[PDB]
Amino acid sequence: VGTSTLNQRLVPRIATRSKVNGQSGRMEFFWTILKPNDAINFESNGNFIA
Amino acid sequence: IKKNSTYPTIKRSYNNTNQEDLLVLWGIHHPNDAAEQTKLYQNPTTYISVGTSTLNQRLVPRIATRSKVNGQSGRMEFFWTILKPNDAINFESNGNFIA
Ligand SMILES: *[C@@H]1O[C@H](CO)[C@@H](O)[C@H](O)[C@H]1NC(C)=O
Ligand SMILES: *[C@@H]1O[C@H](CO)[C@@H](O)[C@H](O)[C@H]1NC(C)=O
Ligand SMILES: *[C@@H]1O[C@H](CO)[C@@H](O)[C@H](O)[C@H]1NC(C)=O
């Protein structure tokens, strides 16, 4: 993902984990302040909670 | 360290039976070149994927030439987590694992 003030690539950390709410896979969410007249460019080939 | 010339993946887990919180300590080795990686761990590209109820952490090593401290250039980063009661910590590593 990338904006005027963002640069981050996020590989998924596959790992055996304990069950929480009956599911052991995790889901790490993100947020960004997109200024006016500023684009956020998503580029993923997997794991993208769009 | 690998036995013979083989380092199988370390599938280990531990339920915190003790209803008392548990501080589980481990670490990741950072060898000074790929030769020290191969000398200790036959797998060139390695990882340490630990996981608990409130943890998700994959740690690749960091091979870099470094200054000698205590007569040793390779580094060793240690980690910690509070394992709650009835919560399991699942270690999964194919190298560099200071178990
Ligand atoms: C759309 O975003 C770009 C930056 O990605 C910005 O330069 C441009 O001004 C924005 N919109 C328009 C059409 O002006
Ligand atoms: C151990 O290493 C030797 C090296 O010659 C090899 O022949 C043998 O198959 C290996 N296996 C074990 C676990 O003994
Ligand atoms: C063992 O750990 C799991 C999480 O991996 C947890 O759900 C469970 O309550 C713990 N204790 C027992 C007795 O199964």
PDB file of C-alpha atoms and ligand atoms in Angstrom:
ATOM      1  CA  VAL A   1       0.000   0.000   0.000  1.00  0.00           C
ATOM      2  CA  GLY A   2       1.169   3.542  -0.669  1.00  0.00           C
ATOM      3  CA  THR A   3       0.031   7.163  -0.342  1.00  0.00           C
ATOM      4  CA  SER A   4       1.774  10.540  -0.397  1.00  0.00           C
ATOM      5  CA  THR A   5       2.859   9.850   3.225  1.00  0.00           C
ATOM      6  CA  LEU A   6       2.731   6.030   3.366  1.00  0.00           C
ATOM      7  CA  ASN A   7       4.991   3.195   2.246  1.00  0.00           C
ATOM      8  CA  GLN A   8       4.385  -0.319   3.563  1.00  0.00           C
ATOM      9  CA  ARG A   9       4.603  -3.876   2.240  1.00  0.00           C
ATOM     10  CA  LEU A  10       3.019  -6.602   4.369  1.00  0.00           C
ATOM     11  CA  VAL A  11       3.863 -10.277   3.883  1.00  0.00           C
ATOM     12  CA  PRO A  12       1.500 -12.560   5.878  1.00  0.00           C
ATOM     13  CA  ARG A  13       3.107 -14.101   8.963  1.00  0.00           C
ATOM     14  CA  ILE A  14       1.931 -17.711   8.735  1.00  0.00           C
ATOM     15  CA  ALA A  15       2.210 -19.352  12.148  1.00  0.00           C
ATOM     16  CA  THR A  16       0.402 -21.943  14.217  1.00  0.00           C
ATOM     17  CA  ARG A  17      -1.653 -20.035  16.792  1.00  0.00           C
ATOM     18  CA  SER A  18      -4.215 -20.603  19.512  1.00  0.00           C
ATOM     19  CA  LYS A  19      -7.933 -20.534  18.783  1.00  0.00           C
ATOM     20  CA  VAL A  20      -9.728 -17.249  19.501  1.00  0.00           C
ATOM     21  CA  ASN A  21     -13.456 -17.124  18.685  1.00  0.00           C
ATOM     22  CA  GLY A  22     -13.050 -20.643  17.305  1.00  0.00           C
ATOM     23  CA  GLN A  23     -10.502 -19.513  14.680  1.00  0.00           C
ATOM     24  CA  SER A  24      -6.707 -19.489  14.991  1.00  0.00           C
ATOM     25  CA  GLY A  25      -5.870 -17.453  11.896  1.00  0.00           C
ATOM     26  CA  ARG A  26      -5.346 -13.765  12.668  1.00  0.00           C
ATOM     27  CA  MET A  27      -6.262 -10.571  10.824  1.00  0.00           C
ATOM     28  CA  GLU A  28      -4.227  -7.399  11.453  1.00  0.00           C
ATOM     29  CA  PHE A  29      -6.084  -4.266  10.325  1.00  0.00           C
ATOM     30  CA  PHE A  30      -4.614  -0.900   9.319  1.00  0.00           C
ATOM     31  CA  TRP A  31      -5.753   2.699   8.906  1.00  0.00           C
ATOM     32  CA  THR A  32      -4.440   5.776   7.102  1.00  0.00           C
ATOM     33  CA  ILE A  33      -5.441   9.430   6.877  1.00  0.00           C
ATOM     34  CA  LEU A  34      -5.832  10.109   3.152  1.00  0.00           C
ATOM     35  CA  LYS A  35      -5.548  13.855   2.624  1.00  0.00           C
ATOM     36  CA  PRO A  36      -7.688  15.586  -0.034  1.00  0.00           C
ATOM     37  CA  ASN A  37      -6.302  15.222  -3.562  1.00  0.00           C
ATOM     38  CA  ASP A  38      -4.199  12.238  -2.417  1.00  0.00           C
ATOM     39  CA  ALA A  39      -4.475   8.662  -3.725  1.00  0.00           C
ATOM     40  CA  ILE A  40      -3.952   5.376  -1.886  1.00  0.00           C
ATOM     41  CA  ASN A  41      -2.692   2.629  -4.207  1.00  0.00           C
ATOM     42  CA  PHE A  42      -3.324  -0.946  -3.082  1.00  0.00           C
ATOM     43  CA  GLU A  43      -1.236  -3.681  -4.686  1.00  0.00           C
ATOM     44  CA  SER A  44      -1.646  -7.232  -3.352  1.00  0.00           C
ATOM     45  CA  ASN A  45      -1.655 -10.779  -4.710  1.00  0.00           C
ATOM     46  CA  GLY A  46      -3.077 -12.296  -1.522  1.00  0.00           C
ATOM     47  CA  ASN A  47      -4.401 -11.868   2.024  1.00  0.00           C
ATOM     48  CA  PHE A  48      -5.995  -8.505   1.107  1.00  0.00           C
ATOM     49  CA  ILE A  49      -8.905  -7.577   3.381  1.00  0.00           C
ATOM     50  CA  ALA A  50      -9.820  -4.826   0.966  1.00  0.00           C
TER      51      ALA A  50
ATOM     52  CA  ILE B   1      22.237 -26.757  16.442  1.00  0.00           C
ATOM     53  CA  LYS B   2      21.545 -29.213  13.625  1.00  0.00           C
ATOM     54  CA  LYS B   3      22.260 -32.897  14.258  1.00  0.00           C
ATOM     55  CA  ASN B   4      24.177 -34.798  11.563  1.00  0.00           C
ATOM     56  CA  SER B   5      23.650 -32.137   8.826  1.00  0.00           C
ATOM     57  CA  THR B   6      19.898 -31.761   9.220  1.00  0.00           C
ATOM     58  CA  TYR B   7      17.698 -29.216  11.047  1.00  0.00           C
ATOM     59  CA  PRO B   8      14.016 -30.266  10.976  1.00  0.00           C
ATOM     60  CA  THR B   9      11.287 -27.758  11.723  1.00  0.00           C
ATOM     61  CA  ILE B  10      10.684 -27.361  15.458  1.00  0.00           C
ATOM     62  CA  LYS B  11       6.968 -28.049  16.001  1.00  0.00           C
ATOM     63  CA  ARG B  12       6.620 -27.342  19.736  1.00  0.00           C
ATOM     64  CA  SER B  13       3.750 -26.124  21.905  1.00  0.00           C
ATOM     65  CA  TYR B  14       3.029 -25.613  25.617  1.00  0.00           C
ATOM     66  CA  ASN B  15      -0.321 -25.061  27.328  1.00  0.00           C
ATOM     67  CA  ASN B  16       0.098 -22.787  30.394  1.00  0.00           C
ATOM     68  CA  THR B  17      -1.543 -25.350  32.745  1.00  0.00           C
ATOM     69  CA  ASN B  18      -0.406 -23.156  35.691  1.00  0.00           C
ATOM     70  CA  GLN B  19      -3.396 -20.801  36.221  1.00  0.00           C
ATOM     71  CA  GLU B  20      -0.540 -18.351  37.016  1.00  0.00           C
ATOM     72  CA  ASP B  21       0.811 -16.206  34.151  1.00  0.00           C
ATOM     73  CA  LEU B  22       4.005 -17.467  32.520  1.00  0.00           C
ATOM     74  CA  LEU B  23       6.919 -15.510  31.030  1.00  0.00           C
ATOM     75  CA  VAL B  24       8.192 -17.572  28.081  1.00  0.00           C
ATOM     76  CA  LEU B  25      11.625 -16.461  26.836  1.00  0.00           C
ATOM     77  CA  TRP B  26      13.279 -17.303  23.521  1.00  0.00           C
ATOM     78  CA  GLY B  27      15.451 -15.618  20.922  1.00  0.00           C
ATOM     79  CA  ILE B  28      16.721 -15.523  17.354  1.00  0.00           C
ATOM     80  CA  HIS B  29      20.356 -15.914  16.290  1.00  0.00           C
ATOM     81  CA  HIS B  30      21.862 -13.505  13.730  1.00  0.00           C
ATOM     82  CA  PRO B  31      24.957 -15.164  12.191  1.00  0.00           C
ATOM     83  CA  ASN B  32      27.702 -13.014  10.718  1.00  0.00           C
ATOM     84  CA  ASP B  33      27.630 -14.663   7.276  1.00  0.00           C
ATOM     85  CA  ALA B  34      25.810 -17.420   5.396  1.00  0.00           C
ATOM     86  CA  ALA B  35      28.788 -19.677   6.159  1.00  0.00           C
ATOM     87  CA  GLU B  36      27.983 -19.404   9.868  1.00  0.00           C
ATOM     88  CA  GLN B  37      24.334 -19.997   8.956  1.00  0.00           C
ATOM     89  CA  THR B  38      25.192 -23.184   7.044  1.00  0.00           C
ATOM     90  CA  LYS B  39      27.735 -24.296   9.665  1.00  0.00           C
ATOM     91  CA  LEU B  40      25.011 -24.233  12.359  1.00  0.00           C
ATOM     92  CA  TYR B  41      21.769 -24.575  10.328  1.00  0.00           C
ATOM     93  CA  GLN B  42      21.668 -26.441   7.014  1.00  0.00           C
ATOM     94  CA  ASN B  43      18.648 -24.387   5.859  1.00  0.00           C
ATOM     95  CA  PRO B  44      19.918 -21.099   4.277  1.00  0.00           C
ATOM     96  CA  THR B  45      16.645 -19.130   4.545  1.00  0.00           C
ATOM     97  CA  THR B  46      15.152 -19.631   8.017  1.00  0.00           C
ATOM     98  CA  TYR B  47      12.392 -18.266  10.239  1.00  0.00           C
ATOM     99  CA  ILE B  48      10.956 -18.337  13.761  1.00  0.00           C
ATOM    100  CA  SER B  49       7.133 -18.158  13.705  1.00  0.00           C
ATOM    101  CA  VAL B  50       5.888 -17.984  17.314  1.00  0.00           C
ATOM    102  CA  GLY B  51       2.199 -17.660  18.109  1.00  0.00           C
ATOM    103  CA  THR B  52      -0.134 -17.326  21.097  1.00  0.00           C
ATOM    104  CA  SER B  53      -3.700 -16.105  21.598  1.00  0.00           C
ATOM    105  CA  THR B  54      -2.398 -12.498  21.637  1.00  0.00           C
ATOM    106  CA  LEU B  55       0.782 -12.935  19.542  1.00  0.00           C
ATOM    107  CA  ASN B  56       1.650 -13.413  15.881  1.00  0.00           C
ATOM    108  CA  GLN B  57       5.361 -13.025  15.189  1.00  0.00           C
ATOM    109  CA  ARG B  58       7.538 -14.345  12.356  1.00  0.00           C
ATOM    110  CA  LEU B  59      11.226 -13.510  12.808  1.00  0.00           C
ATOM    111  CA  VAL B  60      13.623 -14.070   9.915  1.00  0.00           C
ATOM    112  CA  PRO B  61      17.322 -13.768  10.872  1.00  0.00           C
ATOM    113  CA  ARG B  62      19.433 -10.751   9.921  1.00  0.00           C
ATOM    114  CA  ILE B  63      22.799 -11.758   8.475  1.00  0.00           C
ATOM    115  CA  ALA B  64      25.186  -8.804   8.500  1.00  0.00           C
ATOM    116  CA  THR B  65      28.860  -8.206   9.136  1.00  0.00           C
ATOM    117  CA  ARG B  66      29.085  -6.666  12.610  1.00  0.00           C
ATOM    118  CA  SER B  67      31.617  -5.454  15.138  1.00  0.00           C
ATOM    119  CA  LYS B  68      32.957  -7.939  17.674  1.00  0.00           C
ATOM    120  CA  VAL B  69      31.398  -7.583  21.142  1.00  0.00           C
ATOM    121  CA  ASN B  70      32.631 -10.045  23.782  1.00  0.00           C
ATOM    122  CA  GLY B  71      34.815 -11.500  21.033  1.00  0.00           C
ATOM    123  CA  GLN B  72      31.794 -12.485  18.917  1.00  0.00           C
ATOM    124  CA  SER B  73      30.281 -10.646  15.949  1.00  0.00           C
ATOM    125  CA  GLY B  74      27.011 -12.536  15.616  1.00  0.00           C
ATOM    126  CA  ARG B  75      24.047 -11.174  17.561  1.00  0.00           C
ATOM    127  CA  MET B  76      21.165 -12.756  19.457  1.00  0.00           C
ATOM    128  CA  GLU B  77      17.845 -10.940  19.905  1.00  0.00           C
ATOM    129  CA  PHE B  78      15.737 -12.256  22.794  1.00  0.00           C
ATOM    130  CA  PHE B  79      11.949 -11.986  23.090  1.00  0.00           C
ATOM    131  CA  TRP B  80       9.315 -12.498  25.779  1.00  0.00           C
ATOM    132  CA  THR B  81       5.568 -12.968  26.161  1.00  0.00           C
ATOM    133  CA  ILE B  82       3.157 -13.330  29.070  1.00  0.00           C
ATOM    134  CA  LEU B  83       1.387 -16.635  28.420  1.00  0.00           C
ATOM    135  CA  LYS B  84      -2.011 -16.409  30.083  1.00  0.00           C
ATOM    136  CA  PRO B  85      -3.529 -19.465  31.803  1.00  0.00           C
ATOM    137  CA  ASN B  86      -5.072 -21.915  29.327  1.00  0.00           C
ATOM    138  CA  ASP B  87      -3.221 -20.270  26.419  1.00  0.00           C
ATOM    139  CA  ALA B  88      -0.671 -22.137  24.293  1.00  0.00           C
ATOM    140  CA  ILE B  89       2.539 -20.758  22.750  1.00  0.00           C
ATOM    141  CA  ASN B  90       3.383 -22.568  19.505  1.00  0.00           C
ATOM    142  CA  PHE B  91       6.991 -22.374  18.308  1.00  0.00           C
ATOM    143  CA  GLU B  92       7.695 -23.131  14.652  1.00  0.00           C
ATOM    144  CA  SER B  93      11.257 -22.579  13.426  1.00  0.00           C
ATOM    145  CA  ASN B  94      13.704 -24.147  10.964  1.00  0.00           C
ATOM    146  CA  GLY B  95      16.806 -22.313  12.184  1.00  0.00           C
ATOM    147  CA  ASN B  96      18.388 -19.751  14.486  1.00  0.00           C
ATOM    148  CA  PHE B  97      16.042 -20.813  17.317  1.00  0.00           C
ATOM    149  CA  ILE B  98      17.286 -20.063  20.835  1.00  0.00           C
ATOM    150  CA  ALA B  99      14.532 -22.239  22.210  1.00  0.00           C
TER     151      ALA B  99
HETATM  152  C1  LIG C   1      -5.322  12.669  -7.402  1.00  0.00           C
HETATM  153  O1  LIG C   1      -4.221  12.197  -6.646  1.00  0.00           O
HETATM  154  C2  LIG C   1      -2.947  12.668  -7.122  1.00  0.00           C
HETATM  155  C3  LIG C   1      -1.910  12.044  -6.226  1.00  0.00           C
HETATM  156  O2  LIG C   1      -1.987  10.626  -6.299  1.00  0.00           O
HETATM  157  C4  LIG C   1      -2.908  14.193  -7.106  1.00  0.00           C
HETATM  158  O3  LIG C   1      -1.677  14.630  -7.674  1.00  0.00           O
HETATM  159  C5  LIG C   1      -4.064  14.748  -7.927  1.00  0.00           C
HETATM  160  O4  LIG C   1      -4.073  16.167  -7.868  1.00  0.00           O
HETATM  161  C6  LIG C   1      -5.385  14.194  -7.403  1.00  0.00           C
HETATM  162  N1  LIG C   1      -6.574  14.551  -8.150  1.00  0.00           N
HETATM  163  C7  LIG C   1      -6.709  15.397  -9.173  1.00  0.00           C
HETATM  164  C8  LIG C   1      -7.464  14.870 -10.353  1.00  0.00           C
HETATM  165  O5  LIG C   1      -6.274  16.544  -9.141  1.00  0.00           O
HETATM  166  C1  LIG C   2      24.460 -38.950   9.239  1.00  0.00           C
HETATM  167  O1  LIG C   2      25.566 -38.491   8.478  1.00  0.00           O
HETATM  168  C2  LIG C   2      26.168 -39.498   7.643  1.00  0.00           C
HETATM  169  C3  LIG C   2      27.329 -38.835   6.938  1.00  0.00           C
HETATM  170  O2  LIG C   2      28.009 -39.750   6.083  1.00  0.00           O
HETATM  171  C4  LIG C   2      25.139 -40.071   6.673  1.00  0.00           C
HETATM  172  O3  LIG C   2      25.731 -41.142   5.944  1.00  0.00           O
HETATM  173  C5  LIG C   2      23.940 -40.599   7.447  1.00  0.00           C
HETATM  174  O4  LIG C   2      22.933 -41.075   6.566  1.00  0.00           O
HETATM  175  C6  LIG C   2      23.357 -39.507   8.337  1.00  0.00           C
HETATM  176  N1  LIG C   2      22.195 -40.039   9.022  1.00  0.00           N
HETATM  177  C7  LIG C   2      22.085 -40.323  10.323  1.00  0.00           C
HETATM  178  C8  LIG C   2      20.924 -39.693  11.030  1.00  0.00           C
HETATM  179  O5  LIG C   2      22.874 -41.061  10.903  1.00  0.00           O
HETATM  180  C1  LIG C   3      -4.870 -25.102  26.035  1.00  0.00           C
HETATM  181  O1  LIG C   3      -4.611 -24.075  25.092  1.00  0.00           O
HETATM  182  C2  LIG C   3      -5.739 -23.768  24.251  1.00  0.00           C
HETATM  183  C3  LIG C   3      -5.266 -22.729  23.267  1.00  0.00           C
HETATM  184  O2  LIG C   3      -4.243 -23.252  22.431  1.00  0.00           O
HETATM  185  C4  LIG C   3      -6.908 -23.274  25.099  1.00  0.00           C
HETATM  186  O3  LIG C   3      -8.044 -23.092  24.258  1.00  0.00           O
HETATM  187  C5  LIG C   3      -7.238 -24.303  26.171  1.00  0.00           C
HETATM  188  O4  LIG C   3      -8.241 -23.815  27.052  1.00  0.00           O
HETATM  189  C6  LIG C   3      -5.988 -24.651  26.974  1.00  0.00           C
HETATM  190  N1  LIG C   3      -6.234 -25.630  28.016  1.00  0.00           N
HETATM  191  C7  LIG C   3      -6.760 -26.849  27.877  1.00  0.00           C
HETATM  192  C8  LIG C   3      -6.929 -27.627  29.144  1.00  0.00           C
HETATM  193  O5  LIG C   3      -7.079 -27.314  26.787  1.00  0.00           O
END
